[PDB]
Design a protein around this ligand. Structure first.
Ligand SMILES: CCCCCCCCCCCCCCCCCC(=O)OC[C@H](CO[C@@H]1O[C@H](CO[C@H]2O[C@H](CO)[C@H](O)[C@H](O)[C@H]2O)[C@H](O)[C@H](O)[C@H]1O)OC(=O)CCCCCCCCCCCCCCCCC
Ligand SMILES: CCCCCCCCCCCCCCCCCC(=O)OC[C@H](CO[C@@H]1O[C@H](CO[C@H]2O[C@H](CO)[C@H](O)[C@H](O)[C@H]2O)[C@H](O)[C@H](O)[C@H]1O)OC(=O)CCCCCCCCCCCCCCCCC
Ligand code: CL7
Ligand code: CL7
Ligand SMILES: CC(=O)O[C@H]1CC(C)(C)C(=C=C/C(C)=C/C=C/C=C/C=C(C)/C=C2C=C(/C=C/[C@@]34O[C@]3(C)C[C@@H](O)CC4(C)C)C(=O)O/2)[C@](C)(O)C1
Ligand SMILES: CC(=O)O[C@H]1CC(C)(C)C(=C=C/C(C)=C/C=C/C=C/C=C(C)/C=C2C=C(/C=C/[C@@]34O[C@]3(C)C[C@@H](O)CC4(C)C)C(=O)O/2)[C@](C)(O)C1
Ligand SMILES: CC(=O)O[C@H]1CC(C)(C)C(=C=C/C(C)=C/C=C/C=C/C=C(C)/C=C2C=C(/C=C/[C@@]34O[C@]3(C)C[C@@H](O)CC4(C)C)C(=O)O/2)[C@](C)(O)C1
Ligand SMILES: CC(=O)O[C@H]1CC(C)(C)C(=C=C/C(C)=C/C=C/C=C/C=C(C)/C=C2C=C(/C=C/[C@@]34O[C@]3(C)C[C@@H](O)CC4(C)C)C(=O)O/2)[C@](C)(O)C1
Ligand SMILES: CC(=O)O[C@H]1CC(C)(C)C(=C=C/C(C)=C/C=C/C=C/C=C(C)/C=C2C=C(/C=C/[C@@]34O[C@]3(C)C[C@@H](O)CC4(C)C)C(=O)O/2)[C@](C)(O)C1
Ligand SMILES: CC(=O)O[C@H]1CC(C)(C)C(=C=C/C(C)=C/C=C/C=C/C=C(C)/C=C2C=C(/C=C/[C@@]34O[C@]3(C)C[C@@H](O)CC4(C)C)C(=O)O/2)[C@](C)(O)C1
Ligand SMILES: CC(=O)O[C@H]1CC(C)(C)C(=C=C/C(C)=C/C=C/C=C/C=C(C)/C=C2C=C(/C=C/[C@@]34O[C@]3(C)C[C@@H](O)CC4(C)C)C(=O)O/2)[C@](C)(O)C1
Ligand SMILES: CC(=O)O[C@H]1CC(C)(C)C(=C=C/C(C)=C/C=C/C=C/C=C(C)/C=C2C=C(/C=C/[C@@]34O[C@]3(C)C[C@@H](O)CC4(C)C)C(=O)O/2)[C@](C)(O)C1
Ligand SMILES: [Cl-]
Ligand SMILES: [Cl-]
Ligand SMILES: [Cl-]
Ligand SMILES: [Cl-]
Ligand SMILES: [Cl-]
Ligand SMILES: [Cl-]
Ligand code: NA
Ligand code: NA
Ligand code: NA
Ligand code: NA
Lengths: 151, 151
């Protein structure tokens, strides 16, 4: 057990209503988030590959295993995993993020932002309960503060 | 040095002409290979996640690093990496494949086949020199025999 695990449980209280509202079977998530821009996108994927190579390999393995278990508990019409497996996934991903230098995490976020159309966040929020999305985001801000303190 | 490395060099002789002919900047590769089928596709990604969790973590790390180096040597109008980095990537991926039970590799191939339209291979081959694609595939068959002997 660890502090990220405890934090993931609070994050799940704040964000699982939102995860139940996303239609994870929507084909939109295959599309580029805006205009396809292969050279910029490759720049972003390069930042994620650098980060994956820096991350703790045991924690990457645990995060993959958490996703395989989460796929097993998908139910209902939106393809949402169980509450427990949602928390499991979030904690495992928090641990990975805490295992790499903060610059490498920020380089991913900045490089993905560069290819994401400014309309995309509002479009996604429009598909769910806006108050539940805001609740989930405030959850995330609290969770990443625990992540940074392990990092 | 190892036998997969030696095998990757022979594979590169057989397949680098083909890699130079693919337009790696074509946006088609973002599309589903046929009809979008999220539940079947999730089944396939589950097989790949199970395989990623089983793979040797040091060899996964080395394979990520090889891709970051390959991104750095992309040149020309098709986005092809250097000959050296092509071989590097292939060897590193061969090592990963050799680190997991053969059933897990076959489960990925069968699960991806299920979502791939039968026209897709011929469409992709039509974009390159067909003789060079055949040369690359015969290269692959030889390479996977060395991979299986390390597995
Ligand atoms: C064939 C190959 C296949 C490979 C495919 C790879 C896929 C690549 C691309 C897909 C990802 C992008 C799509 C969704 C965007 C979701 C993020 C978002 O909606 O974000 C919404 C935010 C909204 O802006 C925020 O809005 C906030 C609003 O807060 C205010 O209001 C709040 C409301 O509750 C709170 O009260 C809060 O306290 C208060 O201050 C603040 O102003 C913040 O400063 C501001 O950042 O936009 C921002 O962050 C702007 C930056 C957007 C970055 C977008 C993505 C996130 C970055 C890394 C993701 C990792 C990699 C993704 C790839 C796959 C992973 C494996
Ligand atoms: C937002 C989330 C983002 C996530 C996205 C994830 C992406 C997922 C899907 C994309 C991948 C599919 C697209 C391309 C298909 C390419 C494979 C192919 O063209 O294959 C062409 C072959 C042609 O058939 C073969 O054709 C051969 C022809 O050989 C003959 O002719 C030859 C000619 O030289 C030789 O002479 C040879 O000796 C002689 O026997 C034989 O008949 C073989 O038995 C027969 O299998 O088709 C076959 O294999 C049929 C099976 C097709 C399987 C397709 C893919 C390969 C499977 C695993 C790939 C790994 C995962 C991909 C995902 C990403 C990876 C990280
Ligand atoms: C272990 C390796 C791994 C696997 C096997 C895997 N992922 Mg992830 N993965 C996703 C889907 C996915 C699917 C369908 C799936 C199927 O198996 C997987 N993944 C699997 C997307 C939802 C998502 C990429 C697209 C994306 O960012 O969509 C927004 C993210 C969502 C809805 C997840 C929940 C996030 C918060 C807890 C709650 C919501 C807050 C807010 C309202 C919206 C986000 C704001 C943002 C600024 C924080 C994703 C991530 C991400 C990561 C990372 C590191 C991973 N992954 C890793 C993996 C993000 O940072 C990254 C991430 O969330 O960045 C914030
Ligand atoms: C280390 C983790 C990793 C990273 C960071 C990564 N890949 Mg891969 N990755 C690809 C692109 C890619 C890009 C653009 C890219 C950007 O950075 C990356 N990847 C990055 C696609 C070309 C490809 C998935 C789509 C796909 O299969 O397209 C066909 C494959 C090609 C052209 C690669 C060359 C293959 C042969 C040596 C030569 C050609 C023979 C024949 C004419 C056609 C294929 C026949 C097939 C039955 C063998 C891919 C693979 C694959 C794997 C695996 C394990 C990986 N990856 C792994 C990664 C396939 O098995 C898998 C694979 O090749 O299966 C055969
Ligand atoms: C081999 C293998 O298994 O790989 C695995 C690799 C990983 C990394 C482990 C993995 C993973 C995670 C991944 C990739 C996550 C990707 C998330 C992508 C989210 C994409 C989104 C939000 C895309 C869009 C596109 C939109 C388009 C919006 C608009 O165009 C629209 C409508 C109309 C315009 O007028 C205006 C517009 C509003 C602009 C939008 O609003 O959003 C996974 C899945 O496990 C597969
Ligand atoms: C060895 C191997 O196999 O590796 C494989 C391993 C994987 C995992 C499969 C793999 C992969 C994928 C990877 C690495 C994905 C990386 C995800 C990074 C996500 C980063 C995020 C979300 C970062 C941020 C930063 C943010 C900052 C927000 C704020 O600053 C803002 C704006 C304004 C401030 O006022 C407040 C603030 C709130 C501070 C935020 O909001 O989010 C890959 C590439 O395949 C390689
Ligand atoms: C088709 C289908 O059905 O798919 C099904 C597939 C599944 C898997 C079964 C499934 C599921 C679950 C999924 C997708 C869950 C996704 C969870 C994503 C979690 C992401 C996390 C936590 C990312 C981060 C990034 C962080 C960054 C933190 C920092 O940068 C920040 C901010 C500020 C810096 O100063 C300090 C910092 C610390 C560096 C962090 O702290 O955390 C579902 C829903 O059922 C759909
Ligand atoms: C070859 C093939 O077939 O592969 C298949 C493989 C899969 C895995 C099966 C597959 C899949 C599924 C995938 C990747 C699912 C990914 C889902 C990502 C969902 C992202 C969402 C919801 C994003 C947001 C962003 C939001 C932002 C909200 C706010 O910022 C806004 C506006 C303003 C403020 O208020 C604050 C805020 C509240 C922060 C929101 O509210 O939501 C797919 C697509 O089928 C293809
Ligand atoms: C977060 C992050 O960084 O994730 C990283 C995760 C990884 C795994 C590390 C990673 C990787 C590798 C990946 C995903 C490889 C994916 C390869 C996909 C290949 C897709 C192909 C061939 C798609 C098509 C679609 C076609 C459509 C064809 C047709 O419709 C057409 C025209 C007309 C119809 O009449 C008939 C038709 C002919 C049917 C086609 O012919 O082919 C990467 C890139 O590093 C990103
Ligand atoms: C911990 C962590 O981060 O994990 C992350 C790690 C990664 C790597 C990023 C990641 C990923 C992606 C993964 C696992 C991808 C897996 C790729 C598997 C590829 C398998 C292939 C091509 C298999 C085959 C089998 C074939 C058989 C062909 C033949 O039998 C045929 C027909 C007929 C016979 O007569 C002759 C024959 C020739 C014998 C073939 O031709 O090809 C993921 C999911 O994100 C998790
Ligand atoms: C947008 C852009 O510019 O992107 C740029 C991105 C890069 C990275 C810089 C770049 C590049 C290079 C790339 C993509 C290289 C891709 C290489 C893929 C190699 C895949 C390999 C080896 C897969 C396998 C699968 C195997 C399976 C073997 C078996 O199952 C088989 C058969 C039969 C079983 O009985 C026994 C077995 C042993 C189990 C194997 O043995 O090997 C490029 C080109 O520049 C494009
Ligand atoms: C959000 C965002 O923007 O992400 C971006 C991220 C990236 C990485 C920048 C990105 C990218 C690039 C990607 C994934 C590139 C993937 C390329 C895959 C290429 C696959 C090819 C060539 C496949 C084949 C199959 C063939 C088959 C030929 C044969 O079987 C045939 C018919 C018959 C026999 O003769 C034998 C044979 C000879 C075997 C062939 O000949 O070729 C992209 C798309 O821009 C999106
Ligand atoms: Cl506890
Ligand atoms: Cl571009
Ligand atoms: Cl470790
Ligand atoms: Cl040697
Ligand atoms: Cl479906
Ligand atoms: Cl090891
Ligand atoms: Na460790
Ligand atoms: Na479960
Ligand atoms: Na090892
Ligand atoms: Na190089």
């Amino acid at each position: 057990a660890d502090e990220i695990g405890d934090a993931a449980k609070k994050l799940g209280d704040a964000s699982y209503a939102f995860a139940k509202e996303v239609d994870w079977n929507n084909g939109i998530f295959l599309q580029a988030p805006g205009k396809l821009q292969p050279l910029e996108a490759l720049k972003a994927i390069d930042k994620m590959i650098v980060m994956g190579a820096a991350a703790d390999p045991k924690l990457l393995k645990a995060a993959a295993e958490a996703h395989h278990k989460a796929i097993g508990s998908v139910s209902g019409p939106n393809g949402v995993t169980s509450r427990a497996d949602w928390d499991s996934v979030n904690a495992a991903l928090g641990r990975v993020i805490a295992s790499v230098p903060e610059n490498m995490v920020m380089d991913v976020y900045d490089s993905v932002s560069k290819i994401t159309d400014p309309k995309v966040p509002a479009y996604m929020k429009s598909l769910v309960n806006g108050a539940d999305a805001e609740k989930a985001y405030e959850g995330f801000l609290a969770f990443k503060d625990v992540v940074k303190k392990s990092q």
